[PDB]
Design a protein around this nucleic acid. Structure first.
Lengths: 398, 1120, 136
RNA sequence: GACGGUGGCCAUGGAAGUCGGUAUCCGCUAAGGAGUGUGUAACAACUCACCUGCCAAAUGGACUAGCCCUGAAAAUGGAUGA
RNA sequence: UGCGUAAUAGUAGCAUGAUUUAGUACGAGAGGAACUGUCAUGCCGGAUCACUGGUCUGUAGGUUUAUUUGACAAAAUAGUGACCUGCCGCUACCAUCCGUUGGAUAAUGGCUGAACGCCUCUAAGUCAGAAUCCAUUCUAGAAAC
């Protein structure tokens, strides 16, 4: 039979067809640009943490429009961006099969990441004395010799190198019992230059200010929300059981025809809802913030008008299940993969682009503070409510 | 001028001979934008071009490039400059693209016009049609050359090309000049030169100092190759320009000190100043140096453009300064590149200071040029004029001073009326009746009331904005509404719109009248006024009221409270017009009828009869849709008359549902009009048009017609005429090879006829229709004719003193003067080419004397058998050799008709007849109280004696007899040899060397032949003569245009009709004859379908009766 | 047809209902109702109504009105969608009940537009803007 | 190089070799059809037929049949068996 | 036991409108374009929930019926009593944000250029060049390292 329509796209993109539970609970990387700019200060990739969204008015700069400048609310994603410490370097080697991890070169600086790659060794699923240093942590003073030996090797071996980076989160409230390691392929400059830079980094602990700009197109990588064993009516864009008189709950109806006489791989079918990676591309970003702790706490936006009367940006309270901000942040234009205990591995776009409203530098006005039943608009609404009474409303719920 | 009012103009408008009528005109409205733009700025009652371009005027660059976009509009453009009035008024006549009556009509609404001629093409059907009328009238039209800032801005050339362009224009115009008039000496003047001032005392005297040199008119007083006393112009409008030669001169004057007149002459052609210190030495007047425009004047302009393009702020200013004028205000206010130019060209633009003087110089009074424009169009007719002695009561003295009377009687003239049920602004309400209030409004509704209107509109329903400063302020025409009243006034009420309901009395037209006032009476004339009709196209002249002379006798007056063109609309304030004006009838009048000239006089010789036809006779016999709207069409056609000069509504020749037009698309336009801008009905069109003439080539052979041209033995003339029809309906009894008789009763009452050719000149006059309907019927009751008897003879030669038939006369001796009375049915329309031949005093009660047609001649009695003859042989002349259509190009002959035949032929048909009527034989002399046989004897004076013993009351019954005459005749024609005499217009096509061949090709394609060529004396233009049929001559001009670039100009003159090879047939109506089977191509041609929907035409005649009668549908044919 | 939007299309589609929804005529012409046949520009897909415009042109009919205007399709203009929307602004215009007007195929509204008209619609169709003193 | 009687006769202001049609003949020459086209309003101009210069030995048509190609598109992925 | 590699497989964005161009080219006219740029939409695909809308065992609060607990009160039963609000949450082109760039070719247009003194996009050789092809980007990650 013809079909008989036209459209029937495979309801859903075939491009994510395995649709498993993606392993890495940080945005796993497998992709970076390439360069030899004298500026090698760019590392490619940070990693922040989502702790909710808020919204913002900003007058927009895109002449040709119905109005060239005009107030508009845009939603906006905010992410705690703590310090990336870099416990070591990993070199590489160019080859037929791809590349390879001959073996790492870790300096010293920190050892908190260590008691996360741990509490799992030998009988009874787990123990708390190390049985293994067998793919792991070296010494300190009798470690740097090795680096010296092997730096030269990686200096010569032209295959690219990435930094063994990691974020700090026990410094946030989340207390993550998972190890939060991440590679960051250093780009620009000579191989030698890159390795030197990496070496230098071990002495320090970078933050996102150096990586991205206030106006900078990221490709966020995360893990979407894992919504559970779930149905085809809900897993794809398929129209449902045609009638009430029909006899199914969870169906397509046809699932592939007598046709080639086995079912086809590609046919709408229920499984589990996307907890995949994906790579949302070209998030322009509106602001890097300054870090809250030890002053900067009462300063997230500055002057009255265009930054408005002082405040923290954060959404109030401890939340019944969730996180509240305490470090510098990134204001990504709306939406990112997953919810609010979820690692947004960031990387600058592969093909950094001029276009139009990819780079257009941008300014803000009013900015929200969430939940309406119980609270209002941060410091101002705090005051008014209080004035009205302290028996009625003030706006603080622990 | 920014400030002018109507209070000042009304007083100065009263006086005459110092007003000067001027008008805007073009070939297809090309260069209309330019002319108008410059004028708008000048005019003060519209408050400049800031609050300008109101009251219908759509400016466009497409037009400039080359574009028609025709429109019927008018802006009130009076000027109270100095101490005088100037009735210009922006006339925008749409005209028509092909030659026509329409073109003649629309274009003639102009006095002292400026004419834009040749866009980027000449010798077209466009240019020789609209402006054909304008250059014929000696009204001193000035040569307006096309846009020159196209050569500076768009194409980007140096000012040296301007000269070239000018030359080209002149060349183009030369051709135009050589269509009419003569242009052998004017080809020398189609160049660019200034041969004066070559002497040493002139080259450094009048070039340093002023002195004077002549700029007066030479040879021609039209638009051909003349300065017109310094009013030639180079009209542009890309940022608005109002300039020409005078402007150029002025600048030159300012540099050192030379007179303007001198400079203008220099600038018309080429002149060579060396520029050492404005002194020249000879040697450069035979070899050259450098022309003026690229040296100075246009050079500056060019420089300015360049500056603008690059973007310089001070450079432009410097250039302006150099150019010899002020630099303006907007130099450091805006960024000002084009803005500066715009600013300057609002200060520069008011031409009233310069041009008015020039106009005055050109034209001392409108009284002078009126005498030269009476003899150039219709005023008595196409034959004679009012300027000649024919029709001279009090016209020659009148139109020397212009108008009919100085106290304003009003007249009429067609220029196409406005569309009703859309505009209906002339009303009987207080604010138009009060002439002052309206005037006030007009002067205040440009940019002053606009603000108020705006305020009213945006802030009446409340809350346009939400939380804004619109409702907070609540403006009453204060600070907010003051803005947006300088680029274009938003909602200004431009034409003073209809406050109260529609009462349509709108009209466009022209009238020349004296000092008219409010509450002025005029004697309204009827729907058909005979006296007026009797005055035009003849030498008669007289003024008397109705005493039963017209159809409707009337003694009633109609009011006329204003004179309007609808330029400022409604009943205007400016009504005190001088002798000669561009406005038409006003008040409560839109009657611009053909036979009713609205005047204060009860009757008078009409000053202008309606326009003449470019190509004679374009018609179509359409019919309407839905039953109640049948008279609606007719009604509409009364309004159509008002609009266009020709439509068949007055005097029924072809019935009232027929158009009469001259043109290619004119007819089409007319058709569309009565669905749209008159009656709002919908009608069945039929684009197949013009039935051709059906000519019989030669007589029939020996059968029952012994007087004949010998034999008809041919296979085919073009298609077969023998085996296609006839020989078996009534041919089984008699005639083998054809059929020229009948045998229904079978030799109780039979006849035989012949169709000879007739000479062509004779035919032409017959078909013109000089004879009347009363000339052929009822001469005893009415007056007995005398002048008409000889005229007929002079055309068709036959008389009652001819007892050797038609043959003698046709051959030998043409143009005799004798009496052609006692004729029943002279032709198909009773004024045509056919005639029933008297070759007998009396056969046997047949073929002598009409129903009451007499020459004072009788053998025994006037009594005979005229009732059965006249009705029968009328139908014989109206069914041709293929059924239907009139016999045209033919002189009919009746060999014999015999009633009371006591002989008979034994057969079945005869037997049947006998059974039916119960007669032993036919008669009239005898009776048995049975049968009929009506005659002229009974109604005239009872019984018949002398010529016969008893009166005819016996033989086959009258109806049957009538039927049978038609039949035999029909048969005879069908068998005779025949060819299609196609309708023709000769094409006297004005052509040039390269586009003769192309023209010929077209002719070849669409029938005909080139006869000969006539060459114009002393020019490259010719005029080719060639015959071309009428049906194919439609859409001809367009085709020509398509073929090349309209380089050949067609004009279809009527040169009779000719015999050309095409199959002259159409399937016979009788089914016995269709058993032979006329072919679907050759006996049903596409050229020969002019009959199914191209022949519903009867004011006079078009009757076709159903043949054969014999009692009932059971008793008609039983043994037959 | 017509078509002239805008600049932009004044952003996203929103409706009060697609095909088969009555909205008032809001017009001096004696159309008293407007019932949708379909909407212009809807290219559409498998099973999906041709859905109401925010201020866009529709194939419509006079279901209850003047009998002269009754029957015969008519291009119209939606003026206010009962069912709501957010604009590039951060407001949510919402109305009492759906409404539009019968119009010319160059967009032009016939008489004068009754009641309130969303500004987007006005922007889209200049005639609409012209022929009303309420544009909110 | 590719001329003359000559605008041959027709049609035709004109169509001269060449809108188109007909007869289609001769002079002089190595050589040139009352002319293959392009083109010209039409003549011309160019190009061809037709003749010679130079290069310097092969060339031109018309078919015939061997393989290859064109024809030669249909439905799960794909079969000289691979 | 870390952090990686990526063979293999799959693969996604597709299309319109307005505007500029421009009432310019083009065109006798009537009519009437494009390359580029600009702003939006349709459908589709991936997310999300700042906003709004949706819902309610949050039985969170109120309003009310009947009943029961002597009344007040506070509770129950009514299998969530009904009704109005209504959080977190999940979710709606019933909201929001996001969907790239290199080589390789096709047709086709050439270039030099023979076979075949010329001539030819072709035979040797090669230039440009599709929604195409394959990569880039993106999903999974081999009894693969």
């Amino acid at each position: 039979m013809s079909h008989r329509k036209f459209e029937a796209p495979r309801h859903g993109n075939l491009g994510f067809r395995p649709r498993k539970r993606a392993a890495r609970h940080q945005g796993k990387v497998k992709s970076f640009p390439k360069d030899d700019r004298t500026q090698k200060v760019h590392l490619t990739a940070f990693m922040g943490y989502k702790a909710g969204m808020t919204h913002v008015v900003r007058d927009l700069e895109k002449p040709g429009s119905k109005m060239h400048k005009k107030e508009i609310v845009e939603a906006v994603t905010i992410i705690e961006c703590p310090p990336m410490y870099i416990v070591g370097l990993v070199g590489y080697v160019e080859t037929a099969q791809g590349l390879k991890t001959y073996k790492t070169v870790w300096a010293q600086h920190l050892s908190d990441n260590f008691r996360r790659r741990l509490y799992k060794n030998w009988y009874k699923s787990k123990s708390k004395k190390a049985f293994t240093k067998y793919v792991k942590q070296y010494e300190t003073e009798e470690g740097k010799k090795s680096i010296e030996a092997s730096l030269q090797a990686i200096k010569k071996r032209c295959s690219v190198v990435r930094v063994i980076a990691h974020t700090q989160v026990h410094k946030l409230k989340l207390t993550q019992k998972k190890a939060h390691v991440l590679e960051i392929q250093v780009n620009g400059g000579s191989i030698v230059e890159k390795v030197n830079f990496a070496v230098a980094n071990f002495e320090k602990t970078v933050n996102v200010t150096g990586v991205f700009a206030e106006n900078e197109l990221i490709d966020v990588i995360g893990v979407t929300k894992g919504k559970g064993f779930n149905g085809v009516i809900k897993r794809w864009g398929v129209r449902k059981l045609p009638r009430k008189t029909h006899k199914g709950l969870r169906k397509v109806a046809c699932i592939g025809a007598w046709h080639p006489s086995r079912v086809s791989t590609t046919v709408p079918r229920a499984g589990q809802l996307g907890y995949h990676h994906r790579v949302e591309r070209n998030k322009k970003i509106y602001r890097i913030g300054q870090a809250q702790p030890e002053d900067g706490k009462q300063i997230s936006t500055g002057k009255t008008e265009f930054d408005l009367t002082e405040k923290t940006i954060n959404p109030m309270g401890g939340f019944a299940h969730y996180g509240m901000v305490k470090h510098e942040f990134l204001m990504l234009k709306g939406c990112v993969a997953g919810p609010r205990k979820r690692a947004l591995t960031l990387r600058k776009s592969i093909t950094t682009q001029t276009g139009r409203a990819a780079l257009e530098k941008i300014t803000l006005k009013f900015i929200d503070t969430s939940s309406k039943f119980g609270h209002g608009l941060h410091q101002t609404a705090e005051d008014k409510t209080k004035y009205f009474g302290v028996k009625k409303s003030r706006s603080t719920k622990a | 001028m920014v400030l002018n009012s109507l209070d000042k103009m009304i007083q100065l408008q009263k006086n005459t001979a110092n007003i000067r009528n001027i008008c805007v005109l073009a070939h297809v409205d090309h260069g209309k934008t330019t002319l108008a733009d410059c004028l708008i700025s000048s005019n003060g009652i519209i408050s400049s071009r800031l609050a300008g371009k109101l009251r219908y005027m759509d400016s466009r660059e497409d037009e400039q490039i080359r574009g028609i976009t025709m429109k019927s509009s008018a802006i009130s453009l009076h000027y109270a400059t100095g101490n005088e009035e100037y009735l210009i008024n922006l006339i925008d006549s749409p005209g028509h693209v092909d030659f026509s009556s329409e073109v003649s009509t629309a274009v003639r609404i102009c006095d002292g016009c400026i004419i834009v001629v040749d866009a980027v093409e000449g010798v077209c059907p466009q240019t020789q049609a609209v402006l054909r009328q304008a250059w014929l009238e000696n009204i001193r039209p000035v040569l307006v050359i096309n846009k020159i800032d196209r050569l500076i801005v768009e194409l980007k050339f140096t000012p040296q090309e301007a000269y070239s362009h000018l030359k080209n224009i002149l060349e183009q115009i030369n051709a135009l000049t050589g269509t009419l008039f003569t242009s052998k000496v004017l080809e020398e003047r189609a160049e660019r030169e200034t041969e004066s001032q070559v002497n040493p005392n002139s080259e450094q005297g009048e070039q340093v100092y002023d002195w004077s040199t002549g700029l007066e008119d030479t040879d021609d007083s039209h638009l051909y190759f003349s300065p017109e006393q310094g009013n030639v112009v180079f009209t542009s409008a890309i940022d608005g320009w109002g300039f020409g030669i005078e402007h150029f001169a002025r600048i030159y004057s300012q540099k050192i000190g030379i007179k303007k007149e001198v400079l203008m002459k220099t600038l018309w052609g080429d002149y060579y100043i060396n520029m050492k210190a404005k002194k020249i030495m000879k040697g450069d007047q035979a070899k050259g140096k450098k022309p003026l425009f690229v040296q100075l004047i246009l050079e500056n302009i060019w420089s300015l453009y360049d500056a603008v393009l690059k973007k310089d702020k001070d450079k432009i200013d410097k250039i302006v300064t150099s150019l010899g004028l002020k630099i303006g205000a907007r130099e450091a206010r805006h960024s000002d590149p084009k803005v500066q130019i715009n600013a300057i060209c609002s200060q520069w633009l008011p031409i009233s200071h310069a041009v008015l003087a020039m106009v005055c110089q050109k034209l001392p009074s409108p009284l002078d040029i009126t005498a030269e424009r009476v003899e150039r169009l219709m005023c008595t007719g196409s034959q004679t004029f009012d300027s000649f002695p024919p029709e001279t009561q009090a016209l020659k003295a009148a139109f020397m001073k212009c108008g009919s009377e100085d106290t304003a009687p009003v007249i009429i003239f067609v220029s196409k009326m406005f569309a009703v049920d859309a505009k209906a602004l002339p009303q009987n309400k207080p604010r138009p009746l009060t002439q002052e209030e309206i005037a006030q409004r007009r002067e205040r509704a440009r940019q002053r009331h606009a603000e108020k209107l705006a305020a009213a509109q945006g802030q009446a329903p409340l809350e346009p904005t939400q939380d804004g400063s619109a409702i907070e302020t609540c403006p009453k025409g204060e600070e907010p509404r003051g803005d947006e009243q300088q680029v274009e006034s938003m909602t200004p009420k431009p034409v003073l719109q209809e406050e109260n309901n529609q009462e349509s009395f709108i009209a466009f037209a022209r009238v020349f009248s004296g000092v008219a006032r409010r509450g002025k009476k005029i004697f309204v004339l009827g729907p058909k006024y005979s006296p007026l009709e009797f005055l035009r196209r003849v030498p008669l002249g007289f003024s008397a009221p109705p005493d039963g002379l017209p159809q409707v006798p009337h003694m009633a007056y109609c009011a006329l409270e204003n004179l309007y063109l609808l330029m400022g609309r409604e009943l205007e304030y400016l009504e005190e017009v001088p002798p000669g004006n561009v406005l038409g009838i006003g008040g409560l009048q839109d009657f611009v009828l053909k036979s009713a000239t609205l005047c204060s006089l009860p009757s008078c010789p009409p000053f202008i009869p309606l326009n003449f036809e470019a190509t004679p006779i374009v018609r179509v016999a359409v019919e309407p849709k839905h039953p109640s709207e049948m008279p609606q069409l007719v009604k509409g056609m009364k309004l159509l008359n008002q609009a266009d000069p020709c439509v068949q509504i007055l005097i029924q020749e072809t019935g009232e549902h027929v158009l009469v037009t001259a043109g290619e698309v004119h007819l089409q336009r007319c058709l569309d009009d009565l669905k749209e801008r008159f009656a709002k009905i919908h009608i069945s069109v039929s684009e197949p048009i013009i039935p051709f003439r059906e000519t019989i080539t030669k007589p029939p052979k020996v059968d029952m017609v012994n007087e004949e041209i010998g034999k008809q033995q041919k296979v085919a003339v073009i298609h077969q005429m023998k085996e296609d029809q006839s020989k078996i309906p009534e041919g089984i009894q008699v005639d083998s090879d054809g059929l020229i008789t009948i045998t229904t009763p079978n030799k109780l009452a039979t006849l035989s006829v012949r169709a000879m050719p007739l000479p062509e000149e004779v035919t032409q006059i017959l078909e013109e229709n000089s004879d009347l309907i009363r000339s052929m019927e009822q001469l005893t009751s009415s007056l007995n004719e005398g002048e008409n008897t000889h005229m007929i003879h002079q055309k068709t030669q036959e008389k009652i003193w001819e007892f050797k038939g038609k043959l003698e006369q046709h051959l030998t001796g043409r143009r005799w003067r004798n009496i052609v009375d006692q004729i029943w049915s002279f032709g198909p329309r009773k004024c045509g080419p056919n005639i029933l031949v008297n070759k007998s005093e009396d056969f046997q009660n047949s073929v002598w004397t009409g129903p009451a047609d007499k020459a004072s001649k009788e053998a025994s009695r006037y009594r005979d058998l005229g009732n059965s003859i006249v009705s029968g042989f009328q139908l014989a002349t109206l069914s041709g050799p293929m059924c239907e259509e009139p016999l045209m190009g033919v002189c009919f002959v009746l060999e014999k008709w015999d009633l009371s035949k006591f002989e008979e032929q034994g057969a079945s048909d005869l037997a049947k007849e006998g059974q039916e009527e119960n007669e032993t034989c036919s008669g009239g002399n005898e009776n048995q109280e049975l049968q009929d046989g009506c005659s002229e004897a009974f109604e005239k004076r009872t019984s018949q004696k002398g010529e016969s013993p008893l009166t005819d009351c016996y033989g086959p019954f009258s109806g049957q007899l009538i039927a049978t005459m038609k039949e035999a005749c029909r048969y005879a024609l069908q068998v005779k040899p025949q060819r299609l005499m196609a309708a023709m217009y000769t094409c006297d096509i004005m052509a040039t060397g390269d586009v003769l061949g192309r023209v010929y090709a077209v002719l070849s394609k669409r029938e005909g032949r080139v006869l000969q060529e006539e060459m114009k004396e002393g020019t490259d233009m010719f005029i080719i003569k060639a015959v071309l049929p009428v049906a194919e001559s439609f859409g001809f001009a367009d085709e020509i245009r398509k073929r090349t670039s309209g380089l050949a100009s067609p004009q279809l003159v009527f040169s009779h009709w000719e015999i050309i090879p095409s199959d002259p047939f159409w399937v016979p109506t009788t089914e016995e004859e269709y058993l032979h089977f006329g072919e679907k191509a050759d006996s049903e041609n596409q050229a020969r379908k002019y009959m199914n929907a191209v022949r519903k035409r009867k004011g006079l005649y078009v009757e076709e009766k159903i043949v054969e009668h014999a009692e009932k549908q059971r008793t008609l044919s039983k043994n037959k | 047809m017509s078509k002239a939007q805008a600049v932009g299309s004044n952003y996203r589609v929103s409706l009060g209902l697609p095909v088969g929804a009555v909205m008032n005529s809001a017009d001096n012409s004696g159309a008293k109702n407007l019932y949708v046949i379909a909407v212009k520009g809807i290219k559409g897909r498998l099973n999906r109504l041709p859905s109401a415009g925010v201020g866009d042109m529709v194939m419509a009919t006079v279901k209850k009105g003047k009998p002269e205007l009754r029957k015969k399709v008519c291009t119209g203009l939606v003026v206010r969608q009962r069912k709501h929307w957010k604009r590039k602004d951060g407001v949510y215009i919402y109305f009492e009940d759906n409404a539009g007007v019968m119009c010319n195929p160059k967009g032009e509204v016939k008489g004068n537009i009754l009641g309130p008209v969303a500004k987007e619609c006005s922007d889209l169709w200049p005639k609409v803007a012209t022929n009303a003193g309420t544009i909110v």
